[PDB]
Design a protein around this ligand. Structure first.
Ligand SMILES: [Mg+2]
Ligand SMILES: [Mg+2]
Lengths: 121, 121
């Protein structure tokens, strides 16, 4: 119901300009904040590590987007470990079939809908 | 062109019966083998670790499905490390919008198509 959502950074929240940071994908940050308002947890899930991760985090922080955690299952993660996050949902531009715009991402999460639902009329 | 594809196990290759292993999702193993024939690399990407991972790997091996690697970027992975795989594609039943059946997964990879393409007529 409330969910832990893994969100990719490059190509997902911003245009893919790695090692640099691209322009924001329209409504990315706002949509994610709306999801937090709805009590979902956001975890940043990026191949970024070290200062390139830090750069992604500060870029988000400056837009008032702060993560439950970054590349961890919880902010002080060994113990009950797995390398892959235990997230309930993955938002990633490299997901097979590609990611739709943030409008549709939001409707899908909110209304519990598949691409199939979205498109079927 | 040839791609490194991360593939989830539970809910993706088999019905989700974790810690047990479910029935195969129709045409999962066959479709993945077809992808290997086309020179893609398959990496198993699962929260499974230890003997539960081993159980997933042997279940696949017994059906003649063998991975480029399991929860690593390459079979002897630190060095150029990131916790998240560097895969080009992710096939995961927890991808936002859900995963379609393996028929459509295959068409999308093969024909370079988005859900948008698939559905637009
Ligand atoms: Mg990306
Ligand atoms: Mg799964």
């Amino acid at each position: 119901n409330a969910m832990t959502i893994a969100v990719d950074f490059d190509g997902t929240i911003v245009e893919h300009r790695y090692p640099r940071i691209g322009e924001e994908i329209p409504f990315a940050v706002e949509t994610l904040k709306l999801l937090q308002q709805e009590k979902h947890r956001l975890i940043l899930w990026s191949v970024r590590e070290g200062e390139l991760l830090d750069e992604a985090i500060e870029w988000c922080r400056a837009r008032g987007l702060e993560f439950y955690a970054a590349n961890k299952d919880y902010p002080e993660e060994h113990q009950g470990f797995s390398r892959k996050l235990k997230a309930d949902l993955f938002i990633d531009d490299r997901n097979v079939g590609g990611i739709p715009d943030w409008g549709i991402i939001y409707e899908m999460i909110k209304e519990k809908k598949t691409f199939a639902d979205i498109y079927s009329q």
